[PDB]
Amino acid sequence: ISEFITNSGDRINTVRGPITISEAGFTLTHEHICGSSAGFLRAWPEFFGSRAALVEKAVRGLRRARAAGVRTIVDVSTFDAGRDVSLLAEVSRAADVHIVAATGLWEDPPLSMRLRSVEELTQFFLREIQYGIEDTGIRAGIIKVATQGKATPFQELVLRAAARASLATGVPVTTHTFASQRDGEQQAAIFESEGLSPSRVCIGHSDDTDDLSYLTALAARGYLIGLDGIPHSAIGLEDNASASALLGNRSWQTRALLIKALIDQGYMKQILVSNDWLFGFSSYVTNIMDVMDSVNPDGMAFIPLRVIPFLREKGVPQETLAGITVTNPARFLSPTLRAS
Amino acid sequence: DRINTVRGPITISEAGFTLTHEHICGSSAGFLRAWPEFFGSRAALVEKAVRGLRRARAAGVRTIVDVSTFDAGRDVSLLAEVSRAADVHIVAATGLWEDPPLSMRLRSVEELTQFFLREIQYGIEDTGIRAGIIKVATQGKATPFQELVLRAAARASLATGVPVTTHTFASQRDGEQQAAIFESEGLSPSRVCIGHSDDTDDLSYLTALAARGYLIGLDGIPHSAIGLEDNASASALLGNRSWQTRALLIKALIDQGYMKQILVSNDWLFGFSSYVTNIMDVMDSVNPDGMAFIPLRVIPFLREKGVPQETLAGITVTNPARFLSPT
Numbered sequence: 001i002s003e004f005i006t007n008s009g010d011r012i013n014t015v016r017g018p019i020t021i022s023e024a025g026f027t028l029t030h031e032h033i034c035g036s037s038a039g040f041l042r043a044w045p046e047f048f049g050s051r052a053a054l055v056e057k058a059v060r061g062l063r064r065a066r067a068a069g070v071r072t073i074v075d076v077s078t079f080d081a082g083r084d085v086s087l088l089a090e091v092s093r094a095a096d097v098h099i100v101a102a103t104g105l106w107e108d109p110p111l112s113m114r115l116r117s118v119e120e121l122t123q124f125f126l127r128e129i130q131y132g133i134e135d136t137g138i139r140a141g142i143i144k145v146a147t148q149g150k151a152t153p154f155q156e157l158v159l160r161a162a163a164r165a166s167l168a169t170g171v172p173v174t175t176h177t178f179a180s181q182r183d184g185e186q187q188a189a190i191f192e193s194e195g196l197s198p199s200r201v202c203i204g205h206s207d208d209t210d211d212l213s214y215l216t217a218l219a220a221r222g223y224l225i226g227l228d229g230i231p232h233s234a235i236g237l238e239d240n241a242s243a244s245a246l247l248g249n250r251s252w253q254t255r256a257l258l259i260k261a262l263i264d265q266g267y268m269k270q271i272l273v274s275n276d277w278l279f280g281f282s283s284y285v286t287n288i289m290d291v292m293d294s295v296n297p298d299g300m301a302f303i304p305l306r307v308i309p310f311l312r313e314k315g316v317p318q319e320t321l322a323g324i325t326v327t328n329p330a331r332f333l334s335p336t337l338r339a340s
Numbered sequence: 341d342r343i344n345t346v347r348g349p350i351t352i353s354e355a356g357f358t359l360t361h362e363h364i365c366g367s368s369a370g371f372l373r374a375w376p377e378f379f380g381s382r383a384a385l386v387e388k389a390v391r392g393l394r395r396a397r398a399a400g401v402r403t404i405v406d407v408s409t410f411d412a413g414r415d416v417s418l419l420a421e422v423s424r425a426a427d428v429h430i431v432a433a434t435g436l437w438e439d440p441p442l443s444m445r446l447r448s449v450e451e452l453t454q455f456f457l458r459e460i461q462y463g464i465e466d467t468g469i470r471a472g473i474i475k476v477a478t479q480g481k482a483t484p485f486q487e488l489v490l491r492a493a494a495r496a497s498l499a500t501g502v503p504v505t506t507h508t509f510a511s512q513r514d515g516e517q518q519a520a521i522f523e524s525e526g527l528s529p530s531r532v533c534i535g536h537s538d539d540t541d542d543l544s545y546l547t548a549l550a551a552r553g554y555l556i557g558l559d560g561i562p563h564s565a566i567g568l569e570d571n572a573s574a575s576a577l578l579g580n581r582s583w584q585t586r587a588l589l590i591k592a593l594i595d596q597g598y599m600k601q602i603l604v605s606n607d608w609l610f611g612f613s614s615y616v617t618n619i620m621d622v623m624d625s626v627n628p629d630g631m632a633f634i635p636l637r638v639i640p641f642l643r644e645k646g647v648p649q650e651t652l653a654g655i656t657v658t659n660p661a662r663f664l665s666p667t
């Protein structure tokens with residue numbers, strides 16, 4: 001019954017305010033409006049043509065995803081990935097797509113973050129969840145963290161501060177991994193040393209690897225497996241070294257078949273899927289957004305328009321695909337009880 | 341004729357006594373807006389900076405050059421607010437310091453030139469406030485990216501006439517490599533201040549650069565960890581040379597004939613988030629005068645050493661105006 005109930009119930013924070021869990025609907029759990037650096041969009045909007053050009057590009061892209069069935073995206077851009085929550089709020093309103101904003105730290109923290117203690121980082125993450133981001137009043141609904149191989153000492157602090165903020169607020173944790181180095185195992189160990197429940201943790205970029213034994217072992221422990229970069233592929237772009245380095249040479253079909261493999265091995269309930277797409281991208285080489293758009297014009301609509309029909313023909317029932325894209329994110333994003 | 345400040349353009353005669361290397365807040369891009377509670381609050385930081393700039397003003401300072409770049413967390417709206425409430429001109433900076441994020445580190449020399457030009461010719465962010473100086477940095481041998489920033493700074497200076505000021509590891513003679521790269525771009529040494537030059541005691545390094553026409557930034561005079569020897573982080577940042585030792589380098593360059601090329605400052609701040617947490621309180625505990633340290637302590641020290649008032653006015657008024665005046 002309660003799955004049909006919109007006008008009451010528990011709540012997820014978005015850039016437009018709280019929404020009920022049922023309103024979230026089809027949710028992409030790892031996306032970006034703009035992948036940048038802190039303060040960069042405000043200091044140099046001409047890098048993106050203009051701020052207005054970026055807004056208009058993002059609103060059209062979100063409308064394309066919405067027409068394909070998407071109702072919510074989780075923007076896992078942190079402070080140091082140049083998250084501008086005022087941009088998210090504007091494009092969410094214009095496109096009528098819910099956007100959940102993130103706290104945490106990604107792979108480019110400035111000195112003012114790198115020098116902080118685990119206690120200080122915990123207060124910063126709590127601030128963005130409990131008080132709001134900057135002076136906007138918009139509260140983060142997820143905590144994003146990152147490793148790229150064996151964790152640095154600072155990255156361990158970030159992982160611990162994220163676990164502590166999650167336990168205190170109930171909001172979930174989502175991670176960036178170097179999947180081929182099995183980063184999720186060390187992340188899991190640190191999270192579990194802090195008492196964090198695996199069901200509150202998504203081990204991301206897990207479709208970057210073909211090692212099913214690594215993925216199923218994490219899923220068997222209750223971790224969520226983020227198969228979040230399905231359209232990332234430089235096939236056909238072999239003469240472009242920067243695009244090949246970033247997007248890899250594994251096909252989207254290979255990445256998507258990992259979704260079916262986890263389903264076949266009984267781990268449907270542990271799967272989250274996404275595109276890891278963006279509408280602006282300044283933290284890499286200059287032409288990269290144009291290159292990515294030439295590869296995947298569907299943008300964030302790639303999961304519903306391409307991946308779902310591909311898995312359907314492979315025999316995955318629609319109800320299973322709806323469970324992965326609607327129910328699984330709703331359980332992930334719904335805050336748990338605060339500790340104490 | 342005019343110098344751009346955070347309150348708009350001013351004429352050369354309005355600059356007056358000018359501190360040429362200062363910071364309202366040493367931070368990181370976006371950090372003040374995202375975590376103002378690190379500084380107590382934004383309002384507390386404003387109040388502290390206004391009290392400090394008002395004390396400097398009462399001591400005779402009329403202008404400071406805030407050499408905080410994008411990646412040092414420059415918030416030009418903060419600079420404008422504090423400048424207005426203390427009635428002290430503030431010149432803002434473009435360029436890049438020692439902590440550029442990926443979106444900067446990945447850019448070409450042409451792209452960086454366009455960014456520096458934007459902040460000088462158009463304005464910083466959406467504020468309409470234009471930079472009046474370009475800040476660059478090395479810490480020993482330049483990284484490949486730092487070479488790009490030095491060349492972009494030279495190109496922006498040549499296009500606009502605004503000067504370049506540098507951060508050095510002075511004991512590694514970084515000014516020599518900076519000079520080499522600048523001159524390979526056709527930049528005049530008279531448009532360049534080699535900063536943190538009081539961090540070294542090698543007079544021959546400084547005089548050779550000044551004999552080539554460079555300006556010499558003796559800009560961290562009150563930086564000293566004397567009395568803080570049990571504090572490893574303060575000692576590493578501030579050094580164990582006394583302020584008197586740093587100030588005597590001013591007199592030495594005067595005595596060697598370079599008074600027209602000396603620029604003096606405090607390199608002080610009112611907030612400081614890019615280092616260890618307690619550092620601003622520690623620094624304030626050894627120099628309560630803050631930015632007033634140059635007029636209240638260094639000036640009398642040099643006057644007792646026999647430096648005439650006309651020479652000290654030349655260094656603190658004439659030189660900064662000549663340096664900041666475009667082209």
Ligand SMILES: C[C@@H]1C[C@@H](O)OC(C)(C)O1
Nearest residue numbers: 032035036081246276277
């Ligand atoms: C800012 C984001 C982070 C991660 O999702 O990688 C990509 C390349 C998509 O950039």
Ligand SMILES: C[C@@H]1C[C@@H](O)OC(C)(C)O1
Nearest residue numbers: 363365366367412577607
């Ligand atoms: C932000 C400023 C930059 C440079 O002047 O170093 C100090 C330590 C004084 O911090």
Ligand SMILES: [Zn+2]
Nearest residue numbers: 175176177205
């Ligand atoms: Zn990532």
Ligand SMILES: [Zn+2]
Nearest residue numbers: 030031076276
């Ligand atoms: Zn991402």
Ligand SMILES: [Zn+2]
Nearest residue numbers: 506507508536
């Ligand atoms: Zn410096």
Ligand SMILES: [Zn+2]
Nearest residue numbers: 361363407607
């Ligand atoms: Zn400085």
